[PDB]
From a paper:
Acid sensing ion channels (ASICs) are voltage-insensitive and proton-gated members of the epithelial sodium channel/degenerin (ENaC/DEG) superfamily of ion channels that assemble as homo- or heterotrimeric sodium-selective ion channels and are expressed throughout vertebrate central and peripheral nervous systems. ASICs exhibit a simple three-state gating scheme, populating a non-conducting resting state at high pH, opening upon exposure to protons and quickly desensitizing, recovering proton-sensitivity only upon return to high pH. The homotrimeric splice variant ASIC1a is highly enriched in the central nervous system (CNS) and participates in numerous physiological processes including learning and memory and nociception. ASIC1a activity is modulated by endogenous divalent cations including Zn2+, Mg2+, and Ca2+ and the modification of ASIC1a gating by extracellular Ca2+ has been an area of active investigation.
To better explore the state-dependence of divalent cation binding to ASICs, we soaked crystals of the Δ13 construct of chicken ASIC1a grown at low pH in Ba2+, following a protocol identical to that used for Δ25 crystals grown at high pH. Crystals of desensitized Δ13 channels belong to the H3 space group and were obtained at low pH. At low pH the Δ13 construct adopts the canonical desensitized channel structure, exhibiting a collapsed acidic pocket and closed gate. Inspection of anomalous difference electron density maps revealed a strong, ellipsoidal density for Ba2+ at the acidic pocket, indicating the presence of at least one bound ion. Similar to the 6 σ site within the resting channel’s acidic pocket, the Ba2+ site of the desensitized channel is positioned near the carboxy-terminus of α5 at the mouth of the pocket. The proximity of numerous acidic residues indicates possible coordination of Ba2+ by Asp 238, Asp 350 and Glu 354, all of which are located between 3.4 and 4.3 Å from the Ba2+ site. Notably, divalent cation sites within the resting channel’s central vestibule at high pH are absent on the desensitized channel at low pH. Moreover, despite a slight contraction at the central vestibule of the desensitized channel, the conformation of the single Gln and three Glu residues that comprise the Ba2+ binding site on the resting channel site are remarkably similar in both resting and desensitized states. As such, the absence of an anomalous signal for Ba2+ for the desensitized channel, in addition to the presence of titratable resides lining the binding site, suggest that one or more of the aforementioned glutamate is protonated at low pH, thus disfavoring the binding of divalent cations. At low pH, the desensitized channel contains a single Ba2+ site at the edge of the acidic pocket.
Author numbering:
A (entry chain A), B (entry chain A), C (entry chain A): 42 to 455
Amino acid sequence: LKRVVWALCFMGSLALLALVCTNRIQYYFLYPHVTKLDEVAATRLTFPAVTFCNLNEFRFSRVTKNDLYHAGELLALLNNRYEIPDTQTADEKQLEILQDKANFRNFKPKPFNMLEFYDRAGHDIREMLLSCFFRGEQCSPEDFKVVFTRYGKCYTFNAGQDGKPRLITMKGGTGNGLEIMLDIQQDEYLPVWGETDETSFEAGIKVQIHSQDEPPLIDQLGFGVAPGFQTFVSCQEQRLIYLPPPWGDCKATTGDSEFYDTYSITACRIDCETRYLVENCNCRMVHMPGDAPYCTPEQYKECADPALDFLVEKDNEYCVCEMPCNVTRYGKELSMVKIPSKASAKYLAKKYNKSEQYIGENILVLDIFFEALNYETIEQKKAYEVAGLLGDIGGQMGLFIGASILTVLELFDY
Amino acid sequence: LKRVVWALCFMGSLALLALVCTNRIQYYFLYPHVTKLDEVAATRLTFPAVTFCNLNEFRFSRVTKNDLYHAGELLALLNNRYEIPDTQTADEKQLEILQDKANFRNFKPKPFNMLEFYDRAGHDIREMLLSCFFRGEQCSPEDFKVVFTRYGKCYTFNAGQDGKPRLITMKGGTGNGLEIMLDIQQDEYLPVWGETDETSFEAGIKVQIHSQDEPPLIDQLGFGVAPGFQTFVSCQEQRLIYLPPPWGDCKATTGDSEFYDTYSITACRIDCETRYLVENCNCRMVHMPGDAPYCTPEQYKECADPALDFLVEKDNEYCVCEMPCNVTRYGKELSMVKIPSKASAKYLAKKYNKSEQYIGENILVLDIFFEALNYETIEQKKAYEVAGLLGDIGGQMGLFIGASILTVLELFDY
Amino acid sequence: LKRVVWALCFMGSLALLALVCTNRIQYYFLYPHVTKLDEVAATRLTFPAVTFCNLNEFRFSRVTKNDLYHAGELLALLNNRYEIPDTQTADEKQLEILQDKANFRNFKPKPFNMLEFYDRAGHDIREMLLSCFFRGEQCSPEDFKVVFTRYGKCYTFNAGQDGKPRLITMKGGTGNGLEIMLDIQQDEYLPVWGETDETSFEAGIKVQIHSQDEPPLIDQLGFGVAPGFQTFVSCQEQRLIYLPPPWGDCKATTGDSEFYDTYSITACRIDCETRYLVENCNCRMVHMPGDAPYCTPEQYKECADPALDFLVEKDNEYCVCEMPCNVTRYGKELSMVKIPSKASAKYLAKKYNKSEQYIGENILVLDIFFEALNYETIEQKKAYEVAGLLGDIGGQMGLFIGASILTVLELFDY
Ligand SMILES: [Cl-]
Ligand SMILES: [Cl-]
Ligand SMILES: [Cl-]
């Protein structure tokens, strides 16, 4: 009667238990994850490395007759007949110089490679750096490590190598970071007579803020700074931590991955770009690692350059990288004020033995610091551990029928 | 004795179970949610649409005597007596022109509407676009779709309509995005003699980056770009996914919502603004959808303009929109360098048949790209599913008393 | 036989239960937390306070002979012998003035304090503010509250004090925020003849956006705005809510913490900086709270200034603050256009009785507003409540052995 009528109700209770338990178990086998995000004002924070590059790759006063011979075409300074292009943007003063050192009448070529050309004619930290201060202490060129990029001879402050103890940061604000005054030296910019990958229409510098153990990709990922301004960059360190499989695609940062000691997206890209250029050109660009021969100006103009433009512009399948397990991103907010003021133009002009207009067209101040909330963690965390699954399917087993693994295994037998 | 003394302890065990189970069940009926945030370097990413507008709405050379007659007051070029205001910012060259075409002695008005005025006098992509490149390929005006905003005749790159396959992006960096050189043509800016909603004190352009299926609100939400700089915009695609009720207020993006095929905040605003202007003015602005008649200059000056200023400035209750279930936000970091350099000014001047000063005051380069971590997901996820509640209240039922639904329903009866 | 052979299997079942239950209980005693992040288009949002400061601290026309006597050395206008430094950046017009009022032949010093000097010579909101509009309504200096910073006499719009109902914001876009036109008055900038903490090489202003009940730290945390541009700041209100111990280090915002009614990182810093300066100098700077005597120019130059530079640059242990439970951060995206255009330069020049060049070097427009997704919540939430632990260890107890607290306590006794 009523005792056996709610045994069918018991059949319904079993029917329910089936759907709910298969729910929590499919949910387990989706491997769901959630996010733990903590923005905080840190302490003992490690100051990142700061790489910068002048937008003019070579110095007009340092280009020699041999430099002009080997590389004048790459720089659009000579046509294919080793002469000044008749379609040149004449300057009565500059053109006299160039056609004086473009006179190869008594000239016999001498050995030449691009790395020495960049290292020698590239802008010099010792005459660009007008002022550097970190947390109240003044820097020198000794504190900037020479690094070569596609821009040429570039510099990294707080590179952290050289056994030099990396610098730290405690609070937020300008006084707890870097400030540098620079002269971009527009009077040393090479004439632009055509368009190549080595000349530019812009005056200023390129900057990129990165981990000490992450290489720079300043050509693609950096930001610019204009002459005649003071730029404030308020930063924030964002540490991103991902889960390995099966929860997500994530590569161990101690990656057994060629040219660099640390695995990062940028390093993976530079690796592949190097393999690609060596493979297709038998030639490496000045900034690439490895041991291939550096490209000659003809190899730069004909093979290496379009190879890299292809990799960073058109390629969709050859070169793609995985996500690491640890990634460091730097949020930033930029801001400008004008330099110099009328009250100070004559002061700066006098101090550096330069014209007032020159100061207006070449001088530049850069402040790099962190805000109050200077450190941020974005860590992926597992959302349904196996134990919580067993405890849940357990409260579900016990709910509708009050069974156990003993009751089943024992009752499945006896 | 001791057997019946811990039956009171059993009463305490029941007392505990009550509070804990009512805890997990109230917690269920709060409908709590958490967040799943994944910043990643994507692939096959869809490039957004990029809308831009010159800050000068009309071209001084294209304003005709009929255009000046109908609209000269809206542009503060004529007072209420159809004449040059005596309080004009005289220019010996410009004033001769305007008062030459403000001579209505032999003039009889001709038909006129604002849409044709904007379309004709508005700046032209074919003479502003000095250079466009996307991922190594050069663009033409064919790649820019004409869109009308409150600025006038504006343009959208990669609008994605026209059956043109939307463009994709793979890596981070400048080479994997758009770069355009523009001439803002300050020599064609109309004289500003007063303050209206059609004239501006600033030179440059306005830009807004949006989904192909999200309309632009460039007047309110866009950013500016100044002449004489190259601006870098490092972007990041942020996909935001919300939960529908009862977990949150969230509107289905396939919204059955008038003028556009997709529901977005911006489209909802443009919808309501159109209804409002039609209702209160019997008149639609040139950029609004629907089928009302376009406003005459008198309707613009007297009714439509203050109506829209009211909606976008003062309104607090008439026009408010819900949150969609899918939202696309684009993070961005801006950066400038100066253009032109001294080395290149004469080059650019020669190439475009323009003065060096003109190049300094009108020329502008814009790079739009993504960083390495170019894609970000912010998805709301349910925090306490019903199954996990039952499994939990289950481990709680089994803990203190070891009961089941059978034990109760059966014991509640027999 | 087979009945007693799976009692050893029962021993294995117990072995499993031990590890899994000790897993969920250690997990409980790690006190894990997760994050609830909601970016939304809000309504009835409270507009923050906006503090700004001219980069020139004193006005050259307001510096009197007594002001020059007491403070001329602090400003690098006089050497240690109360005379013009022979290494001055001469200006035939300015130098006549200064050496006219540096003539102390018939001068006897008069009482002097830095607060009155700042208040009097500091730039005036009533002659800098050329235009202010909030949500369609125009502002006056009445809407700006005077606040003193290390820059001097500064101003805060929508300070929210004075019983003035704080302003609200509804939508995203320029029309739903503040726009102001300013003259930085480079013609009133004091000559810079040396480097001190009161003079600057830059022209423009400093801005900081903060809660009405959070003090400004504009020297360290603010951003700059350059003359000759219109700058757009697209903002986003981010409310961060942390967990108190034992889940995290977090201080109650109703903090019983000295000089201010609300606990914030900035207020904690200003508190400690004040204690430090009073302790080490018997002296407070003009912008610090409390009741110590203000510093004399000699105390500024010799003790107070290097004390604060030390605190904001070098200090690593003396002054460090805890994290509050509620923090308000404002995301922002900046953007510039040039001002004035050629079409409008003469207009603005005429309107304000100023030269066209002056307009180009001193005039500045600032728009502060929010984007569509104008409000963001980042709330830490508990990840494993005690009830869910008991329900889980419960489904685990019931799973392997089907026990209960009664079964144990009763069986541990009888
Ligand atoms: Cl690559
Ligand atoms: Cl609206
Ligand atoms: Cl401090």
